[PDB]
Design a protein around this ligand. Structure first.
Ligand SMILES: *[C@@H]1O[C@H](CO[C@@H]2O[C@@H](C)[C@@H](O)[C@@H](O)[C@@H]2O)[C@@H](O[C@@H]2O[C@H](CO)[C@@H](O[C@@H]3O[C@H](CO)[C@@H](O)[C@H](O[C@@H]4O[C@H](CO)[C@@H](O)[C@H](O)[C@@H]4O)[C@@H]3O)[C@H](O)[C@H]2NC(C)=O)[C@H](O[C@@H]2O[C@@H](C)[C@@H](O)[C@@H](O)[C@@H]2O)[C@H]1NC(C)=O
Ligand SMILES: *[C@@H]1O[C@H](CO)[C@@H](OC2O[C@H](CO)[C@@H](O[C@@H]3O[C@H](CO[C@@H]4O[C@H](CO)[C@@H](O)[C@H](O)[C@@H]4O)[C@@H](O)[C@H](O[C@H]4O[C@H](CO)[C@@H](O)[C@H](O)[C@@H]4O)[C@@H]3O)[C@H](O)[C@H]2NC(C)=O)[C@H](O)[C@H]1NC(C)=O
Ligand SMILES: *[C@@H]1O[C@H](CO)[C@@H](O[C@@H]2O[C@H](CO)[C@@H](O[C@@H]3O[C@H](CO[C@H]4O[C@H](CO)[C@@H](O)[C@H](O)[C@@H]4O)[C@@H](O)[C@H](O[C@H]4O[C@H](CO)[C@@H](O)[C@H](O)[C@@H]4O)[C@@H]3O)[C@H](O)[C@H]2NC(C)=O)[C@H](O)[C@H]1NC(C)=O
Ligand SMILES: *[C@@H]1O[C@H](CO)[C@@H](O[C@@H]2O[C@H](CO)[C@@H](O[C@H]3O[C@H](CO[C@H]4O[C@H](CO)[C@@H](O)[C@H](O)[C@@H]4O)[C@@H](O)[C@H](O[C@@H]4O[C@H](CO)[C@@H](O)[C@H](O)[C@@H]4O)[C@@H]3O)[C@H](O)[C@H]2NC(C)=O)[C@H](O)[C@H]1NC(C)=O
Ligand SMILES: *[C@@H]1O[C@H](CO)[C@@H](O[C@@H]2O[C@H](CO)[C@@H](O[C@@H]3O[C@H](CO)[C@@H](O)[C@H](O[C@H]4O[C@H](CO)[C@@H](O)[C@H](O)[C@@H]4O)[C@@H]3O)[C@H](O)[C@H]2NC(C)=O)[C@H](O)[C@H]1NC(C)=O
Ligand SMILES: *[C@@H]1O[C@H](CO)[C@@H](O[C@@H]2O[C@H](CO)[C@@H](O[C@H]3O[C@H](CO)[C@@H](O)[C@H](O[C@@H]4O[C@H](CO)[C@@H](O)[C@H](O)[C@@H]4O)[C@@H]3O)[C@H](O)[C@H]2NC(C)=O)[C@H](O)[C@H]1NC(C)=O
Ligand SMILES: *[C@@H]1O[C@H](CO)[C@@H](O[C@@H]2O[C@H](CO)[C@@H](O[C@H]3O[C@H](CO)[C@@H](O)[C@H](O)[C@@H]3O)[C@H](O)[C@H]2NC(C)=O)[C@H](O)[C@H]1NC(C)=O
Ligand SMILES: *[C@@H]1O[C@H](CO[C@@H]2O[C@@H](C)[C@@H](O)[C@@H](O)[C@@H]2O)[C@@H](O[C@H]2O[C@H](CO)[C@@H](O)[C@H](O)[C@H]2NC(C)=O)[C@H](O)[C@H]1NC(C)=O
Ligand SMILES: *[C@@H]1O[C@H](CO)[C@@H](OC2O[C@H](CO)[C@@H](O)[C@H](O)[C@H]2NC(C)=O)[C@H](O)[C@H]1NC(C)=O
Ligand SMILES: *[C@@H]1O[C@H](CO)[C@@H](O[C@@H]2O[C@H](CO)[C@@H](O)[C@H](O)[C@H]2NC(C)=O)[C@H](O)[C@H]1NC(C)=O
Ligand SMILES: *[C@@H]1O[C@H](CO)[C@@H](O)[C@H](O)[C@H]1NC(C)=O
Ligand SMILES: *[C@@H]1O[C@H](CO)[C@@H](O)[C@H](O)[C@H]1NC(C)=O
Ligand SMILES: *[C@@H]1O[C@H](CO)[C@@H](O)[C@H](O)[C@H]1NC(C)=O
Lengths: 595, 14, 185
């Protein structure tokens, strides 16, 4: 009857008149309509013509919060997410007394939080993320009657984290991350949030110790206290987090040992306590938990990686680099898990690489630099086509590289530097369609550079210095137009450079020093547009230095210890070039000690 | 739109 | 690290049609495996090689955090804006090669703090003002090219500048001095 009539369409026409609508999101809002229910963003639950939800997210709407919308009596859900809503959020938002969901995230809202948000008794979900709100969190926020989600992430809140937020009994998610809060301790009272499933306090300028109270949060699923200045130990109390799946404590000043009590966390799958000052050994009890991801990099950890970690059927990520860990990697690592990212670099690990790291066919990153690993690359890795980044440098590895390993189709970086690797580069290198950086320096590699290296059109770096490579440069090498670095110094390369060098238009560094190259430096040397570093020293290059060299703007030139003859172009007869032409008996220039 | 990093593991790698 | 953070700051203020900075992953421990970046044995940046990459945009003062950088190669691009004063903080720089760009404003007097600089090529820009006298204090300077700018005022002929010839200061708006052969007021 009369009792149940409304002016919802009229209220909504006032919302429309109060907002800039450049993309005409509100054109459907036609006052000739019998009902606003069909309007863009509008839903009316029941046959009743009462508006129950307004979702204007991502509409490109601008202007202040339209407080007139509170005159919609049955409005339970309002979203202005991802708009240009601006100015202060008015204290008269509390007039919206039926609101269960309020999402004003990703807007240009400014000033202080209106304390009257606490005076909407029906409010379950409050999201103010990605706004410009500042000042203290109001004391009224301790009095929310039914709030389950409080999200104030990515604002300019500059007060201390309030203990009264622990007084919201119904709260399931406390998300305060990325606020320039005044340095504050985690309030012990947050342990009284018995229904809490998410505590997200990343980059909140938190200080002091993690309180033992937090162990009382039996329903917590995400504890995230990362990017803070928390000190003290990871508490053994955290073993009381019965339902926890993810613990993030990275980039803090935490000390002491990883508590074995983390082993009691049956649902724990992700733990990252990286970038701390943790000491002692990784506990076997934690490794027995079937973790999806364990990151403990840049700590002061010692001892052995427990073999139990290789039992997890869920492990895809282990990053424990920058520690003093010793012994062998678990023999069965990768055998029972889809390992994707392995980084054990900057450790004192030794022995052979585990044979089956890529058994499940998902390994992308193999990063083991600065360890004492020995033996041959496992033959299985030749079939690991998922790999994109390979860093085996600064180990004690020996033997041939498995044929197939050179041809992996998605590898972008292959770095075998500072090992005792032997044998040749296989013709299989042709299959490496994604290879950009090839770094083989300081090995015992032998043989000619295969012609298939020229098929690597996207190759940017070829560094193979300090090896026993031999033969003339393959003709295909000069077809590499994306090459910026060619370093073949300290090898046994022989033969002549050809006119094909003119195709190295992107080459910055040409280092062919300490080789057995013969013939003349090609006149096309001056046609290399971005060449700034040229080292042809310690070869048998003969003939006149090309006049084209004067075209280049080199920061480094050395043609010393060759069979070069003739006169120095007067531009090279400068004191700065005094150590660039040494050991060329035929060569006569106007430099002191030359000719 | 200021994109907000999700709650999750750090990603530093060699 | 800090050095990678500083170069990533350059990536985001630079316009990169060819995606030459794609490998510049700021989640890497350091920028040493980044294409166009070369590091020393201590994993510290000594070279940035971005010549003729069709880069547009402005440089950042954050480049001055690279304390071991020796070769800054940003030549043959369309980079606009001023030479950040903070480039004078690059204590180990040997080469400053900003030539063939659209750089405007004055040559920072801070550049005279580069005591190891040997190559200074700022030619083919829109640079204005006088050539800082502090440049004469770089005893290591061997190559200078300030030609094809809009520079004016006295050209120094003392310290490192005594050896320099007219081709170094050619095609400037109103340069005066002994090298110019036009005496100054
Ligand atoms: C909160 O946002 C409101 C909506 O604005 C738009 O969104 C914001 C976030 C920015 O992105 C704005 O750039 C964007 O426009 C702001 O209110 C609006 O304010 C503008 C003025 O900037 C109002 O315009 C006058 O509008 C009349 C009628 O349309 C024009 O005839 C008049 O004329 C000229 O416009 C030409 C354009 O070529 C200009 O060159 C010329 O100089 C004149 O300005 C004005 O533009 C606009 O109507 C108004 N929109 C709505 C829906 O109300 C709001 O700003 C504040 O209120 C206005 C009245 C003004 O006093 C302003 O200074 C206030 O700050 C803004 N509030 C805050 C706190 O930022
Ligand atoms: C936050 O909110 C943003 C709204 O402000 C939202 O933004 C935009 O993103 C959408 C989707 O990516 C863009 O989409 C389409 O619009 C095209 C028209 O637009 C443009 O041209 C102008 C030049 O005058 C230029 O300035 C703009 O940037 C655009 O390039 C349109 O052609 C396109 O068409 C099709 O897609 C629809 C979608 O269903 C389909 O039905 C059609 O058949 C057709 O296939 C899109 O409609 C929109 O342009 C962006 N607008 C603005 C203002 O940025 C953000 O994506 C949102 N963010 C999040 C995280 O949610
Ligand atoms: C090229 O290189 C030359 C050589 O280094 C530079 O010249 C010098 O410049 C510095 C400043 O940049 C001068 O420093 C100052 O010392 C003054 C006292 O100097 C005299 O007495 C001493 C001691 O006997 C002598 O050695 C010296 O030669 C002088 O006779 C101070 O009073 C100065 O100080 C004040 O101002 C500063 C702020 O700028 C305050 O912080 C101080 O508290 C103080 O009040 C100053 O410290 C130096 O004297 C110069 N030497 C010479 C030989 O000239 C050129 O400047 C440089 N660049 C250019 C563009 O040419
Ligand atoms: C307060 O903070 C918390 C914590 O930051 C916020 O919640 C967490 O919010 C995120 C973002 O929505 C949720 O996201 C994801 O997880 C769900 C659930 O599912 C899983 O199962 C699938 C099945 O294969 C698997 O792929 C997932 O990895 C996961 O194990 C996903 O459905 C969801 O979506 C996919 O996400 C992709 C990545 O963005 C998309 O590209 C896809 O298109 C697809 O949608 C997403 O991965 C977390 O689940 C959630 N965590 C918890 C413990 O609740 C919370 O939102 C925040 N609220 C406020 C208001 O600030
Ligand atoms: C990666 O592998 C490369 C190559 O194997 C490696 O570089 C080499 O490093 C050593 C030590 O850092 C270099 O040695 C110097 O070598 C010269 C010979 O050119 C020697 O004259 C020097 O001195 C000696 O005398 C000392 C007297 O006390 C002895 O203690 C010492 O053992 C020497 O006899 C000095 O050792 C070597 O020249 C380089 N080689 C090349 C090609 O650069 C590099 O260090 C490895 N990097 C890592 C991080 O492991
Ligand atoms: C050659 O090697 C390079 C370097 O390893 C390969 O490169 C890269 O590709 C990644 C995946 O395509 C890409 O990842 C991400 O970051 C993107 C934003 O910068 C983001 O949009 C992506 O999205 C999610 O991506 C996952 C991928 O599994 C999807 O499944 C989701 O649906 C999302 O879209 C990624 O987070 C990375 O940025 C890029 N790295 C570099 C340094 O360029 C390249 O693919 C290789 N090519 C070949 C042919 O193998
Ligand atoms: C901690 O959470 C408590 C539970 O929400 C909260 O108590 C509640 O406080 C409000 C506001 O004072 C009371 O609200 C209203 O009803 C009374 C009836 O006597 C009126 O006098 C008030 O004007 C108002 O309408 C709730 O009655 C009360 N609820 C319960 C169950 O006790 C505490 O205030 C919170 N404490 C802190 C420090 O934040
Ligand atoms: C977690 O709450 C404990 C229970 O307390 C209170 O009642 C709530 C419903 C709420 O109104 C809250 O404001 C009250 O603190 C609390 O213990 C307290 O009760 C004991 C008696 O058993 C009392 O001696 C003590 O002083 C009370 N504590 C406080 C802080 O006032 C418990 O301390 C709290 N957890 C913390 C602070 O970490
Ligand atoms: C070159 O000659 C310059 C001019 O006399 C001289 O310049 C200046 O240095 C003095 C003394 O430090 C300053 O008081 C004066 O402000 C400076 N003048 C200008 C124009 O900047 C240089 O220092 C001399 N260079 C060398 C290497 O001696
Ligand atoms: C550097 O700048 C000079 C001056 O603008 C450039 O020289 C001119 O080039 C045009 C052709 O583009 C000639 O027609 C003019 O005669 C030149 N002017 C002078 C004064 O020499 C020069 O090309 C630029 N250098 C480079 C490498 O591009
Ligand atoms: C964000 O808040 C600050 C401080 O309250 C204010 O000065 C600034 O204008 C606001 N920024 C935006 C983007 O509105
Ligand atoms: C760790 O925190 C410091 C600030 O305390 C910051 O500079 C650094 O970049 C952070 N690194 C990561 C990976 O979080
Ligand atoms: C060089 O760096 C210091 C900070 O260490 C700064 O104070 C100084 O002003 C910088 N110089 C320039 C010219 O920016």
């Amino acid at each position: 009857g009369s009792s149940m009539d409304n002016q919802d369409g009229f209220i909504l026409q006032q919302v429309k008149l109060s907002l800039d609508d450049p993309d005409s999101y509100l054109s459907s809002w036609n006052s000739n309509d019998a009902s606003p229910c069909r309007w863009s963003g509008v839903s009316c639950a029941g046959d009743f013509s009462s508006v129950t939800s307004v979702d204007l997210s991502s509409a490109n709407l601008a202007g202040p919060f339209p407080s007139v919308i509170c005159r919609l009596s049955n409005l339970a859900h309002l979203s202005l997410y991802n708009n240009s809503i601006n100015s202060t959020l008015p204290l008269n938002i509390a007039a919206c007394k039926s609101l269960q969901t309020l999402d004003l995230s990703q807007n240009l809202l400014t000033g202080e939080l209106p304390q009257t948000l606490a005076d909407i008794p029906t409010l379950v979900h409050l999201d103010l993320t990605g706004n410009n709100f500042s000042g203290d969190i109001p004391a009224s926020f301790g009095k929310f009657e039914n709030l389950e989600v409080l999200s104030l992430v990515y604002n300019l809140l500059d007060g201390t984290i309030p203990p009264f937020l622990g007084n919201i009994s119904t709260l399931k998610m406390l998300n305060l991350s990325y606020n320039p809060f005044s340095p504050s301790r985690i309030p012990p009272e947050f342990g009284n949030l018995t229904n809490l499933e998410v505590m997200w306090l990343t980059e909140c300028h938190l200080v002091g110790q993690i309180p033992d109270s937090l162990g009382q949060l039996s329903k917590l699923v995400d504890l995230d206290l990362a990017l803070n200045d928390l000190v003290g130990h990871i508490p053994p109390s955290l073993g009381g987090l019965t339902n926890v799946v993810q613990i993030e404590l990275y980039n803090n000043s935490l000390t002491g040992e990883i508590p074995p009590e983390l082993g009691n966390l049956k649902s724990l799958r992700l733990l990252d306590a990286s970038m701390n000052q943790l000491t002692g050994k990784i506990p076997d009890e934690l490794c027995r938990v079937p973790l999806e991801s364990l990151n403990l990099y840049e700590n002061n950890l010692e001892g052995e990686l427990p073999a139990s970690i290789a039992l997890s059927p869920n492990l895809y990520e282990i990053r424990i680099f920058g520690n003093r860990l010793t012994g062998g990697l678990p023999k069965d690592l990768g055998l029972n898990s889809p390992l994707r990212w392995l980084d054990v670099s900057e450790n004192e690990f030794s022995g052979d690489l585990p044979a089956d790291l890529c058994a499940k066919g998902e390994l992308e990153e193999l990063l083991i630099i600065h360890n004492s690993f020995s033996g041959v690359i496992p033959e299985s890795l030749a079939d690991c086509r998922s790999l994109t980044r390979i860093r085996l440098a600064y180990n004690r590895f020996s033997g041939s590289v498995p044929t197939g390993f050179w041809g992996l189709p998605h590898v972008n970086l292959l770095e075998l530097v500072n090992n005792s690797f032997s044998g040749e580069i296989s013709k299989s290198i042709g299959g490496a369609s994604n290879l950009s950086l090839l770094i083989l320096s300081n090995n015992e590699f032998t043989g000619s550079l295969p012609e298939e290296i020229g098929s690597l059109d996207n190759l940017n770096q070829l560094s193979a210095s300090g090896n026993k490579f031999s033969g003339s440069l393959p003709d295909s090498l000069m077809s590499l137009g994306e090459l910026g670095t060619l370093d073949l110094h300290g090898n046994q390369f022989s033969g002549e450079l050809t006119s094909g060098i003119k195709s190295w238009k992107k080459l910055n560094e040409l280092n062919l020093a300490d080789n057995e190259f013969t013939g003349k430096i090609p006149d096309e040397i001056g046609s290399l547009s971005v060449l700034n570093y040229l080292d042809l020293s310690g070869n048998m290059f003969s003939g006149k230095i090309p006049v084209s060299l004067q075209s280049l703007k080199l920061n480094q030139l050395n043609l010393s210890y060759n069979r070069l003859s003739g006169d120095l172009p007067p531009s090279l007869a400068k004191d700065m070039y005094k150590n660039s032409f040494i050991g060329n008996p035929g060569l006569c220039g106007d430099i002191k000690g030359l000719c | 739109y200021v994109p907000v990093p999700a709650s999750g593991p750090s990603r530093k790698h060699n | 690290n800090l050095e990678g953070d500083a170069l990533h700051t350059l990536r985001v203020t630079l316009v990169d049609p060819n995606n030459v900075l794609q490998s510049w992953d700021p989640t890497l421990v350091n920028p040493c495996t980044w294409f166009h970046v070369t590091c020393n044995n201590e994993n510290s940046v000594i070279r940035v090689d971005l010549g003729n990459a069709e880069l547009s945009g402005h440089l950042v003062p954050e480049l001055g955090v690279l304390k071991n950088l020796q070769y800054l190669e940003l030549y043959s691009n369309n980079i606009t804006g001023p030479i950040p004063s903070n480039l004078g903080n690059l204590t180990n720089l040997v080469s400053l090669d900003l030539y063939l760009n659209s750089f405007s404003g004055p040559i920072p007097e801070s550049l005279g703090k580069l005591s190891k600089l040997r190559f200074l090529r700022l030619n083919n820009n829109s640079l204005t003002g006088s050539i800082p006298m502090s440049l004469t204090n770089i005893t290591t300077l061997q190559v200078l090219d300030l030609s094809n700018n809009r520079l004016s005022g006295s050209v120094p002929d003392n310290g490192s500048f005594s050896l320099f010839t007219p081709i170094s200061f050619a095609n400037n708006l109103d340069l005066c001095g002994p090298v110019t052969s036009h005496p100054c007021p």
